[PDB]
Design a protein around this nucleic acid. Sequence first.
DNA 1: AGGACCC
DNA 2: TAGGGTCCT
DNA 3: AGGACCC
DNA 4: TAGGGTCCT
Lengths: 373, 373
Amino acid sequence: ASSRVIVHVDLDCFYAQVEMISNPELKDKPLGVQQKYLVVTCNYEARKLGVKKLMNVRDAKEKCPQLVLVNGEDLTRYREMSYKVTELLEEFSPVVERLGFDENFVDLTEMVEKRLQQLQSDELSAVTVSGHVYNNQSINLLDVLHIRLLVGSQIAAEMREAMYNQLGLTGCAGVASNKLLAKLVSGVFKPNQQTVLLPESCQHLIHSLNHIKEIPGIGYKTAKCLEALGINSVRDLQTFSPKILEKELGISVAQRIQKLSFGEDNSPVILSGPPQSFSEEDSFKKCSSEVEAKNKIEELLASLLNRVCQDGRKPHTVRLIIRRYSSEKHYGRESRQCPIPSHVIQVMTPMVDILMKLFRNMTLLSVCFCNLK
Amino acid sequence: ASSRVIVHVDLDCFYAQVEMISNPELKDKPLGVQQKYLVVTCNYEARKLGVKKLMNVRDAKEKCPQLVLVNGEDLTRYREMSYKVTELLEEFSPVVERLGFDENFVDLTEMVEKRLQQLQSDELSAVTVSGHVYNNQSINLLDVLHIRLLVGSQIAAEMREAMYNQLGLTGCAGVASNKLLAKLVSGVFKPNQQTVLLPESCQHLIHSLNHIKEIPGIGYKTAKCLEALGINSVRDLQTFSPKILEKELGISVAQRIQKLSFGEDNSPVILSGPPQSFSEEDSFKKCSSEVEAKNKIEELLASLLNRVCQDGRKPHTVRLIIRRYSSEKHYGRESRQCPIPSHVIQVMTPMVDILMKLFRNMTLLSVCFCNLK
DNA sequence: AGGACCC
DNA sequence: TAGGGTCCT
DNA sequence: AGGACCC
DNA sequence: TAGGGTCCT
Ligand SMILES: Cc1cn([C@H]2C[C@H](O)[C@@H](COP(=O)(O)OP(=O)(O)OP(=O)(O)O)O2)c(=O)[nH]c1=O
Ligand SMILES: Cc1cn([C@H]2C[C@H](O)[C@@H](COP(=O)(O)OP(=O)(O)OP(=O)(O)O)O2)c(=O)[nH]c1=O
Ligand SMILES: [Mg+2]
Ligand SMILES: [Mg+2]
Ligand SMILES: [Mg+2]
Ligand SMILES: [Mg+2]
């Protein structure tokens, strides 16, 4: 119960794929998917012309006039397709973990060992890789770890083939020995490809990063703090004092990210299962009067109500969120959670009023249904 | 799936019982159990002479010179006996809920209906009560609810008989139609007795309370707020405006306690199962220098380590708590939680140092092990 | 993390 | 006010 | 409730 | 910086 074979699956310009399947006349034309004043993602044709993900509509059109834009504010179809992807991967090995709507981790460890046991002592000398080998590293067929990771790259290919045959979707996969590594190496060959990481090339991968923010687990905030201390490269963090970090991010944040800086990550692939929340949201820049915008609240509800129904499980808690108009404190959301009366769990009319009392205890609005059962 | 038969079991001067069993020469002498400068509880002989629970050692001895005191700082034996009680009740009906070390709720609803189905149409006219009937109310053998509650009082008696035969312990029980009511009515006949509440006497029970703090669910804080608004009696709260309360405690706190004021409570009996935490603690009045008292921290650890072991399940998180020396802000604890490295989950020497870094990020000290699996 | 509630 | 312990925001 | 992290 | 979503303190 030590070495693992993990796969990280990450789809190509996800929203844009879904749009392109829904409207075929959009293929081979450069496409962006817009959400308010943001081109949240664009297809590969668009990326060729300079359009970057998360670019404002102004810079996307003055970097590419030639640019088709569809609105992706309503995540319904992306959500449905997201679950069809995860369910398919569930069929290969039941323990699948989602990250966002288009990334899935799967622990292939038991499956690999089952395929290996099936192989007589002979054809195993013919075990080949499927896809790229990170850093063009050589394979050693006598190395049991190389063998498992190559069998791991074959499961990956089959997964990708299925995703395409069954759902029409393309994507990348990366096979490695932990979650961190698999995710980092799934991006090396970007458009519709897969890469596998042999142990000997772990340090090469980790050091190919240019900023420690590029490590999954280190975000906007810990990154800024790491800098204030002179830690900029992955090596800086590697070599930085445990005690000084221990004592400035907390032993938790610190002993963990330091492991990450070496490529070490023991966190298991967890079964995501059904969602732990359903929320809808809406932006508008200081468009909220201050109760001419309960109407906004009835919209979000109409939608959600229907959704949360579909699943079967009912939420036992409601939440409203907000934010207010100023000089780039951006960071600031507020909420009031409240339990959902046992009576209404089986419609609109009373819901509205709960959220409203909740409003009163209190740039943009949203409603979460959590604690599902 | 509507009406329920719930039992609330509450032992007599619990700590003192356990002590009296351990040292027989202490029976029939007035006994208190001391924790620092507090007589946390005393036997019935002591209560006859004016000793009240939670009375300071000074007032207990100048209200009763004649007074034997043993130290109850170490809860080990009370804890063991607490679980033997719950386990025994588990044998009657698996869903048992604990409250504190000496109170247990059990939903007798399925058991009652099973006993009733066994009875031919005939002996059911001979169904009698076991114990007191709250308010001396009359029984109506044709009332299906009276019948179920009386069968409920018989299960209660059997429980009490078992607790006594099997563990040597005495206690009270109350049978009612919800948790609130069962708990309220278990105390009416105080020393080693049981009481059953018929529906017709619900309002009588609820109105026999003198302060709304006496309602389970309303504590020191909500009580003080309820007063600031003129709400003193259970009737005041009954009749108080939903909107004005709704808006001053929150819809959650408010719509719930208002139900409680009528005797209405739908909360189900939940299976407590194994504990969700193990902690040890220690007081000392500004006895902590400010690192001459890491030694205090190694004590608590020696103990806990052993405990948390016994169960099997290992904690995945540690926590330290503190409080500081002043003018009756009493209320104020601080803590730093931290995850427990996967390595040490299988000893002392590194633990100490985690808690210590945790100390540094930071009248009395304590250590919790939570998140067990 | 801290609040509120219970024994 | 001891020494615990639980669930919520 | 709010923080931090991720897509 | 959209519109979501997860786990921790
Ligand atoms: C990162 C990010 C993604 N998304 C949406 C848009 C993406 O289509 C989708 C997935 O995120 P990504 O996988 O990072 O983006 P991508 O799949 O579109 O592009 P790539 O081919 O390079 O993998 O989720 C956002 O709405 N906001 C965000 O901040
Ligand atoms: C309420 C309370 C109880 N306890 C301990 C002492 C008690 O023996 C035990 C149980 O609480 P209780 O049941 O309230 O007290 P009791 O069982 O001792 O007395 P009674 O016969 O009237 O039911 O837990 C405390 O340590 N602190 C507290 O604040
Ligand atoms: Mg991605
Ligand atoms: Mg992607
Ligand atoms: Mg009690
Ligand atoms: Mg008791």
